[PDB]
Amino acid sequence: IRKGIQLRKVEEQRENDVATILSRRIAVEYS
């Protein structure tokens, strides 16, 4: 489980797309 958490925190995050661009614009109005 300990190693299972590390393979979800470090192994997590490893664009001219309309959806992507729209997401970023919305994501700012929350964070």
Partner 1 sequence: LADQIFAYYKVMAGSLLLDKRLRSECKNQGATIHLPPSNRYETLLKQRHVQLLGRSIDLNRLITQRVSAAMYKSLELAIGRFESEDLTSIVELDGLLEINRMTHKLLSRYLTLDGFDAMFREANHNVSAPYGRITLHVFWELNYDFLPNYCYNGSTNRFVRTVLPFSQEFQRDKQPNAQPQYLHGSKALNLAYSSIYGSYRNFVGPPHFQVICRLLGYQGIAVVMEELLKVVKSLLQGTILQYVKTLMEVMPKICRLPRHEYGSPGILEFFHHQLKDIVEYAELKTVCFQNLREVGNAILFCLLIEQSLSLEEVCDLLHAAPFQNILPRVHVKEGERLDAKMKRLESKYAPLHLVPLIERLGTPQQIAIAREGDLLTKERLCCGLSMFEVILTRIRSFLDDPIWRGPLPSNGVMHVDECVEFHRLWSAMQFVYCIPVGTHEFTVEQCFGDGLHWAGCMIIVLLGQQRRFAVLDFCYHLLKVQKHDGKDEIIKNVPLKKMVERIRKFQILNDEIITILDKYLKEHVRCFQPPIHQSL
User: Which residues of this protein are in contact with partner 1, per CB under 8 A?
Assistant: 1, 4, 9, 26, 30-31
- Is the CB of 7 or the CB of 16 nearer to partner 1? 7
Least CB distance to partner 1 at residue 4 (A): 7
Q: Least CB distance from residue 9 to partner 1, whole Å?
A: 8
Query: Nearest approach, Cβ of 5 to partner 1 (angstroms)?
Result: 8
Closest residue by Cα to residue 12 from 24, 4, 20, 1: 4
**Measured between alpha carbons, how far is 6 from 12 in angstroms, rounded to an integer?**
9
d(C-alpha 1, C-alpha 18), whole Å: 38
